[PDB]
Amino acid sequence: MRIILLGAPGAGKGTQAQFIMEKYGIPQISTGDMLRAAVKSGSELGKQAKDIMDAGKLVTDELVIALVKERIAQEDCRNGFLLDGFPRTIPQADAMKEAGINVDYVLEFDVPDELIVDRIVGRRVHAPSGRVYHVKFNPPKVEGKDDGTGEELTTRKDDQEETVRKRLVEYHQMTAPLIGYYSKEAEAGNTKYAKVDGTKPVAEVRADLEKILG
Ligand SMILES: Nc1ncnc2c1ncn2[C@@H]1O[C@H](COP(=O)(O)OP(=O)(O)OP(=O)(O)OP(=O)(O)OP(=O)(O)OC[C@H]2O[C@@H](n3cnc4c(N)ncnc43)[C@H](O)[C@@H]2O)[C@@H](O)[C@H]1O
């Protein structure tokens, strides 16, 4: 099956992606992880994102579409995948449609703007796997360590307050309209749409999603 996760910065998409992946056995396609990885390794496809991400702005549709195409062509996506942080704009959604990439579920994670900044300062990550934690809301089993590899967790270069605020603006400008776009898609019978309350505890959000996805 094919799923799109939608919602504001910090809404909880990546956290639940992990559960959907390890549960329904489809790969997580995370544009944020992919772009960070490209920057880290200096890969020709995506190293360009470095400064853009630092400024809290969106990377060009052109760049991210290329990355997803390349990722989605891999054997492990043949029977479905989870798009997490993509599409991010209408043109990104349109490209998918032009390329014949329909999806079965669009899942919207609703969180009030006012919870976003506070929430994200607690965020810690394991960049090699893309796993994410929160020091209060979803701590690692061992303080400061990734559960799976025991490596020291880091803080994302773009998780600073000022940068989160810029991302939230860009989100409302460019990304928020995908709610209407995919709702219309659902009204046309092209996919299923569901909104979840992303203010509930992680386990409860996981439970709600299970109800939706079966
Ligand atoms: N398609 C695209 N086009 C153009 N540019 C692109 C692009 N994709 C990426 N980019 C670029 O990359 C930069 C960052 O993009 P990206 O990394 O994709 O997203 P973000 O806006 O930076 O923040 P997230 O979307 O990763 O948050 P989330 O909804 O996954 O929530 P999370 O599960 O982490 O949780 C947040 C925190 O809270 C915790 N938490 C999770 N759920 C809950 C809960 N229910 N209650 C309490 N805490 C919770 C977590 O543990 C964590 O600490 C962009 O600004 C841009 O430059």
Side-chain angles (χ1 to χ4, degrees), residues 72-130:
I72 255 56
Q74 303 194 349
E75 175 69 9
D76 71 336
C77 285
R78 279 198 54 207
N79 296 315
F81 50 76
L82 179 54
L83 295 168
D84 171 20
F86 182 97
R88 206 67 161 250
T89 65
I90 295 305
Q92 288 174 31
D94 287 339
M96 285 173 69
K97 205 168 182 74
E98 293 301 68
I101 306 167
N102 63 316
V103 305
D104 306 301
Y105 286 93
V106 174
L107 305 169
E108 180 194 344
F109 296 61
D110 182 77
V111 183
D113 287 335
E114 295 91 347
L115 275 58
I116 300 306
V117 166
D118 258 76
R119 185 179 270 194
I120 290 216
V121 298
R123 173 160 70 180
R124 300 299 183 269
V125 302
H126 177 241
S129 62

Side-chain angles (χ1 to χ4, degrees), residues 12-15 31 36 57 59 85 92 123 133 156 200:
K13 306 180 296 291
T15 295
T31 41
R36 288 184 285 275
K57 298 177 177 143
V59 169
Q92 288 174 31
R123 173 160 70 180
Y133 303 86
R156 285 175 32 179
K200 309 198 194 174

Side-chain angles (χ1 to χ4, degrees), residues 151-167:
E151 302 167 15
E152 184 77 2
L153 295 179
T154 58
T155 62
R156 285 175 32 179
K157 307 172 168 62
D158 63 343
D159 274 355
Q160 305 186 257
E161 180 181 50
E162 185 174 354
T163 312
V164 174
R165 270 153 199 165
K166 280 157 174 165
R167 298 217 289 274

Side-chain angles (χ1 to χ4, degrees), residues 9-102:
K13 306 180 296 291
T15 295
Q16 307 291 159
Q18 294 300 320
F19 301 140
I20 290 177
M21 183 171 199
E22 73 178 48
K23 221 268 190 167
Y24 306 92
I26 52 168
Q28 171 190 18
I29 308 307
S30 162
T31 41
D33 284 341
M34 300 175 82
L35 285 162
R36 288 184 285 275
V39 170
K40 181 161 180 294
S41 71
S43 310
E44 168 64 21
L45 189 55
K47 67 182 174 172
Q48 300 81 0
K50 184 195 170 195
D51 289 353
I52 303 180
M53 291 191 289
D54 268 324
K57 298 177 177 143
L58 292 184
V59 169
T60 66
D61 299 326
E62 206 173 4
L63 196 60
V64 173
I65 287 160
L67 275 176
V68 172
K69 183 178 179 180
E70 176 192 53
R71 175 69 187 90
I72 255 56
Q74 303 194 349
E75 175 69 9
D76 71 336
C77 285
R78 279 198 54 207
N79 296 315
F81 50 76
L82 179 54
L83 295 168
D84 171 20
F86 182 97
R88 206 67 161 250
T89 65
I90 295 305
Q92 288 174 31
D94 287 339
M96 285 173 69
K97 205 168 182 74
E98 293 301 68
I101 306 167
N102 63 316

